[PDB]
Amino acid sequence: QELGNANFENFIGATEGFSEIAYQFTSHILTLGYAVMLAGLLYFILTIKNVDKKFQMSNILSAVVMVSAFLLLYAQAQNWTSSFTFNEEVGRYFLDPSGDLFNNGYRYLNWLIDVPMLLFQILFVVSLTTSKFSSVRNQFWFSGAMMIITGYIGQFYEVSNLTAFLVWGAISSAFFFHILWVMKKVINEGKEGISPAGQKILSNIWILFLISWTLYPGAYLMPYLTGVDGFLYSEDGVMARQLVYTIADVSSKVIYGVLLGNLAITLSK
Amino acid sequence: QELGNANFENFIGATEGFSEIAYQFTSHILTLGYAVMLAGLLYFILTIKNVDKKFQMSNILSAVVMVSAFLLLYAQAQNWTSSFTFNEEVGRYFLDPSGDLFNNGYRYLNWLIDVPMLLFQILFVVSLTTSKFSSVRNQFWFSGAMMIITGYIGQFYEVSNLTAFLVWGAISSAFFFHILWVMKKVINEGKEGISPAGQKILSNIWILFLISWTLYPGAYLMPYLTGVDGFLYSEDGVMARQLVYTIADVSSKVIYGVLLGNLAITLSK
Amino acid sequence: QELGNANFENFIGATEGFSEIAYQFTSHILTLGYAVMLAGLLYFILTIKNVDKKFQMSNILSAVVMVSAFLLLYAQAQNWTSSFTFNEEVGRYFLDPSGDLFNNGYRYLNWLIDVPMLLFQILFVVSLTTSKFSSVRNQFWFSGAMMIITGYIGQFYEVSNLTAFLVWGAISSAFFFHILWVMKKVINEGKEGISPAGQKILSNIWILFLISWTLYPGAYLMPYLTGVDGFLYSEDGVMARQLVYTIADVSSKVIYGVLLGNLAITLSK
Amino acid sequence: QELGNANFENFIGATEGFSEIAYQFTSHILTLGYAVMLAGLLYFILTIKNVDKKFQMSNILSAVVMVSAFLLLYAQAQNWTSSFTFNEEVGRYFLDPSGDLFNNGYRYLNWLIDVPMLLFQILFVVSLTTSKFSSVRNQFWFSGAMMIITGYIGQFYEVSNLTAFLVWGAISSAFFFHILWVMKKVINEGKEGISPAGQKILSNIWILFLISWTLYPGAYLMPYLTGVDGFLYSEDGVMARQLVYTIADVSSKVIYGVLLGNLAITLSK
Amino acid sequence: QELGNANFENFIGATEGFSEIAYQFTSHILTLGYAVMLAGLLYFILTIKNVDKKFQMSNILSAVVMVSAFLLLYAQAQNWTSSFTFNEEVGRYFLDPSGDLFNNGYRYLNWLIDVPMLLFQILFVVSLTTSKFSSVRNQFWFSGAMMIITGYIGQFYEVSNLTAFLVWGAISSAFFFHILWVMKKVINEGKEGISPAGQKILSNIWILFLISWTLYPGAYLMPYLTGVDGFLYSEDGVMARQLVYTIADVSSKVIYGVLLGNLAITLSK
């Protein structure tokens, strides 16, 4: 069967197929995904009047990220259940082409608009010292865009052309390190001037950001983390990838937003 | 027909099939389920300004539980009507594999995020005495997560492997008793310092929590409560399970939230 | 073909079929149904600040009834259009089993949660004299629940077993008369102490309640009001039943809520 | 093929079929329809605090009309795209009976709840002189209901029985002239006492009301405005009818509501 | 295969078909489209109280544009995924007529209502000097309507009749230049009287307006920008057109609205 430049999920579903657990779990973890985002949207809106007017822009941007996140992640959950149908004879879910091939593209475009907002909102809670607001913002937005775009191109060849997949992934990584660098500066300059309590939170925010954001490139390689024809190049790798994405999404957006809200309250008078 | 690690609902629907009453009732009870959650969401939002600012976090967390509860339970209602199609010849609903196998997973992931919030919101209304806030919270969140996760794994083998089903159920029960223990402490310490009216409510909250939360493990075993090839291992057991879940969900979330709101008002000045 | 314990709508659609008018009208009247409930929801929310804080609980409960009413009635409207497909040869809509059998169950569960709220909200506008608040509430909630449950069971046998259908209907009627009795007391005690204007409204509320609530049992018997093989035991009876339900729903919930709001304004200072 | 008492759209789609333009345009104009209503809903809600409390009831009723309008007009849109499928051989859209026959009913019952509200809201902005509020209201509500009901019956025979179609249309027209009469009185009495600016607006409101409301009966006859086997008794007549309805709906509800809001501001202090 | 007066997307999908990348990308860019509009809607509503009451009409009109923009663009996204189904044998997406032919009409009607509001909202932030408010408004609204309508007619013949396609496109362009002319005047008169900061923003708004609005006519010709049987008259041209539309939509509505909000704040006291 000819699939072309398709995600590895389609190859597993078209050959081996998915077990009740593998299929159901992937459905539940994606469903929990968009559910958390709508729950977060309601939280950030109902807690806007809990911080000084100057910090409220942080809750608004968190809400903006939640909305778009809910829609894209919701569409993704529907794309999964639509691309795989149960086979009575063997008792496994196989690729149903009539429902379109499954693609992690809806999530990559969710990042495109999110990344910029997530990096931008912290600049409304913390105060830079030697770095210019506009300068930091422009760096985040540029590197952020190039990181997502390059990665979006590579994920299409994660099976059809392993070379292109890694080359683009590498280029993407370049911009990722630059973002980590700028964010590190923002955290340091942010700690200067605030109470020890605020510093404690910024320290936790940096750890959360570092770990949660690293999970994404991990999910990108998931199918090859145990080498070609490895343990992860199966339905196990599919479950792992979608699970990691969900954990990363909740941590990088919802939890990240809650911590910023807590810091905003700490600095509020 | 090969189903594998699927819920017992699929086995009844694939062999005996469901009667108009059995199928329709299950559809109505699941529909009423998500309907109540959206009605509750509107109630908790419209009554936020009825309690002092310090207690408002309780209404917000109730609203958060309602939202996710509406989405997951809605999907669960669709997972039912889609998995069973009517057969004109015999006049019963049989497993329609094209609509995917029915799984009580969506409800298990709803708990995962709910359990933590439900246990945490009471800590914004009552005041601990001989227990540390962070300590109690960490215990609830840990045991709560382990309880749901372990149970989620077991429910997949409720037919394929009765042994694994019970072992996991038992492990889950362990964490459940620990939660009941901590909650009992919270209630007692909560009663100390408040008016007799507030104590009266906390007493009712403890009874509600004890009964409603016990229903879940009951629904877990529902198909075997009358032993293998028993009265409950039929469409009657399916109706019973989904009914008990719905009663438990409404009691543990909506009614539990209303009582907390009433207590918040009682302590409001 | 054996339909079993199914509503009479399915028997008409499976034998005679439905004409363009019969089918279209039923679709339009059910569509208008959920449309009115969402319109009402918006009205009760936008008019909350039009009455004293003590009466606002009435608008909130009206809103709660609207929400659930919209969801259940929206589903009921889908249960119709899905259960009947057009036959080109004869030019009539016949039972399409793939879309499930049509059941007035979604509406019965909508009452289960509504009835309690509708009877309870009037206790926030009027002031009892010799009757205890808790006492009246408990009677409404108990008789209300037993009335709906018993009726829900009977409607399943409206064709399969005419005897069971009437027996349950009769038992249900018992609790209905008890509710009418308690409501009559509440109205009388409510009139005592308020202005002639307020009394005028309570008089209208009693008439509305009496007529609108009586329509339900009428819709229950609709198919046999002209005896077996009568004029109403046709597509005409189907249209009549769904029409009566819609009229009853709009009157008992929306109009009832508007009058309570007008009374609240009359008593507001 | 037997269609029976069906709208003429079905006859054109079942015989000649629809061209890409005819089908696409009808879809676009109906889509724009419900889109405008949801846009209007947001406008009337966000501008409520722009007028004195006494006039705010006008914005609320406009919002009520928008909601219902959005739901019914959305359904009407779906009814279209579902009833006609593309034929590859000939390259035209033909009647797809599996999607139900297309009916302009959803739009008629929409007028049933709208008409009364649209005629009633103007009574909260203008002040009657010699006419009684209750009197005018009762006339609008009665004639309004009889006008819609009679018309709703006739539209079912616009093809099957041209005689019944015209008779009902005529009866409907009777109540329409009575409404125009009462509205004319309301406008005149409304002009007395208000500023020249307010009078200027009421003059515009009367012209808008006169033209927009006249379009409906025009859309009713659309298929026979060029006589039987005429230019309009084709896909051209279908486009014309749905276009006229959309123009009428936007003018009679959205624009009408905006003008009433502007008048409210003019009289606001 | 006979398509008639259909968009070129259908001809590519009916002959060559679409690759996984071409199809998936178009789906992602359209999905991101409606997602951004709902995110913008939430932003404009949550920031209304950030500007003086006199400028708030700008946020309201932005919100109005977002709503209708979300619904239409959502409908446009669905029109895509439904019109093209995957072929297992060749591994490409081909025209699925059962899902209707794809038409960029839903986007042309979104402009019809947007264009007027987008041109009108700037008149609530800036102050004209020698130009009359009513005069400018009437010109925008007239030329705006004629521009969209004429273009909407031409796009139907972008393949069937290249002559009609260009003629209408040309006529449309005429009204486009007139709009650019009037907008230029508004910007100039707007700069007079405001601070250098406000002027800086209006300068950016003019550049954004000029570029973003020019993209639309570019997307209109996209398939012929490399001449007939050119590089762009392929799936590459389809991706390019939908991408350009998405960039134009986000820039002309969301970004344009954000800049107006920033200017409103700059002039706010």
Ligand SMILES: *C/C=C(C)/C=C/C=C(C)/C=C/C1=C(C)CCCC1(C)C
């Ligand atoms: C809420 C969305 C977030 C935080 C998205 C983050 C995305 C990344 C950090 C992506 C990084 C990637 C690489 C560094 C290489 C491989 C491709 C990417 C895009 C997954």
Ligand SMILES: *C/C=C(C)/C=C/C=C(C)/C=C/C1=C(C)CCCC1(C)C
């Ligand atoms: C609103 C959701 C709630 C209250 C969820 C509660 C879940 C439980 C109490 C689950 C308990 C279980 C056991 C003790 C053993 C069997 C497996 C479980 C998870 C059902």
Ligand SMILES: *C/C=C(C)/C=C/C=C(C)/C=C/C1=C(C)CCCC1(C)C
């Ligand atoms: C908004 C929902 C309302 C007011 C529901 C009311 C329901 C009843 C009054 C039901 C009564 C019935 C009987 C008295 C006998 C037959 C069965 C019932 C449940 C229809």
Ligand SMILES: *C/C=C(C)/C=C/C=C(C)/C=C/C1=C(C)CCCC1(C)C
């Ligand atoms: C927003 C809805 C409105 C303004 C509806 C108005 C409806 C009419 C004016 C209907 C009039 C009719 C006739 C005068 C004769 C033919 C049948 C009708 C109902 C279309």
Ligand SMILES: *C/C=C(C)/C=C/C=C(C)/C=C/C1=C(C)CCCC1(C)C
């Ligand atoms: C948010 C919607 C906007 C800004 C829409 C703008 C539309 C145009 C500028 C359209 C212009 C066109 C021409 C100048 C010629 C070809 C046809 C059009 C309509 C695409």
Ligand SMILES: CCCCCCCCCCCCCCCCCCCC
């Ligand atoms: C303060 C709260 C106390 C409320 C008391 C009564 C209200 C609860 C109503 C629920 C009762 C329903 C029980 C159903 C009985 C089983 C029916 C079987 C068919 C005969």
Ligand SMILES: CCCCCCCCCCCCCCCCCCCC
């Ligand atoms: C002010 C509250 C009282 C309102 C009474 C005024 C009239 C409004 C209700 C009109 C009801 C119309 C129902 C039509 C009757 C049946 C139609 C027969 C079809 C020819």
Ligand SMILES: CCCCCCCCCCCCCCCCCCCC
């Ligand atoms: C005071 C403002 C007056 C204008 C507002 C009303 C807007 C409606 C404009 C009427 C034009 C509709 C005609 C549509 C033509 C369709 C072809 C009809 C064939 C008989």
Ligand code: NA
């Ligand atoms: Na997003």
Ligand code: NA
């Ligand atoms: Na599936």
Ligand code: NA
């Ligand atoms: Na939940």
Ligand code: NA
């Ligand atoms: Na089904």
Ligand code: NA
């Ligand atoms: Na309800």
Ligand code: NA
């Ligand atoms: Na149907």
Ligand code: NA
């Ligand atoms: Na309406």
Ligand code: NA
């Ligand atoms: Na179609």
